[PDB]
């Protein structure tokens, strides 16, 4: 089964998933210079104030903070988006050094970590029918730059030790997400797809500009999480990350000049 190590990972995806070669991959490079500012681009609606944080997941590749997506929420609207797309879960994709991790990449440079707010169109009513359609995601990413400590994801940290291993969970009832945002919502917007397996091509990227920083210690205890079961040799959860994938036909447009 898949996975991110020399056997399983990222070079060998497409075996099983055909799609890994398509025509609209994700991450990718985002080069600043050749993005457009589109003034025609809204600005982006983050409404989290009701957000309903239930449990966290260790499931093998990340860990997910779960949400209540039966009832409009937490939900992101306007940006590049037409409709209502609940927020499901967040996770985070993370190297095994400050200088990897990050799935998207701006000029080259690679953060130490990437935040995905994960969201689907109510349009669709339920997040499996979403994903078979192209415009049925839309996924908010933050770049994690290594710095000052990031106080909102600390809560995240404190709990990572009690789902160590893959299959673990944990009860992670209210947890405010908008703690995890950087002051500006300034983003870059292009059309893409999950970066895991089943890399279906139903998302509406939306990568804000500003990264927030987090401290070497919050991305530290990442690095202690487990790919592997509980009583299976220890694999530590380090670099979970695809690659950036070709362009191809596809413009990546700013809201900001
Ligand atoms: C249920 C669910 O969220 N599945 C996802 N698979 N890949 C995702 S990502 N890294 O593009 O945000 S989310
Ligand atoms: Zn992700």
């Known amino acids: 089964h898949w996975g991110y190590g020399k056997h399983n990972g990222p070079e060998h995806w497409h075996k099983d998933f055909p799609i890994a070669k398509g025509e609209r991959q994700s991450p990718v490079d985002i080069d600043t210079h050749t993005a457009k500012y589109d003034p025609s681009l809204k600005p982006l609606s983050v409404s989290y104030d009701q957000a309903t944080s239930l449990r966290i997941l260790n499931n093998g590749h990340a860990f997910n903070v779960e949400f209540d997506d039966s009832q409009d929420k937490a939900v992101l609207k306007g940006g590049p988006l037409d409709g209502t797309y609940r927020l499901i879960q967040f996770h985070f994709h993370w190297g ?57 994801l600390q809560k995240v940290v404190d709990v990572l030790d009690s789902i160590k291993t893959k299959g673990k969970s944990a009860d992670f009832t209210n947890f405010d997400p908008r703690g995890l945002l950087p002051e500006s919502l300034d983003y870059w917007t292009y059309p893409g797809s999950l970066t895991t397996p089943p890399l279906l091509e139903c998302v509406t990227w939306i990568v804000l500009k500003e990264p927030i920083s987090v401290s070497s210690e919050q991305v530290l205890k990442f690095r202690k999480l487990n790919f592997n079961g509980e009583g299976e040799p220890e694999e530590l959860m380090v670099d979970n990350w695809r690659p950036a994938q070709p362009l191809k036909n596809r413009q990546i447009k700013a809201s900001f000049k």
């Open 96 to 152: 095994s050094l400050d200088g990897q991790g990050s799935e998207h990449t701006v000029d080259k440079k690679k953060y130490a970590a990437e935040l995905h707010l994960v969201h689907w169109n109510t349009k669709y009513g339920d997040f499996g029918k979403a994903v078979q359609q192209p415009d049925g995601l839309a996924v908010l990413g933050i770049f994690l730059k290594v710095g000052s400590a990031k106080p909102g």
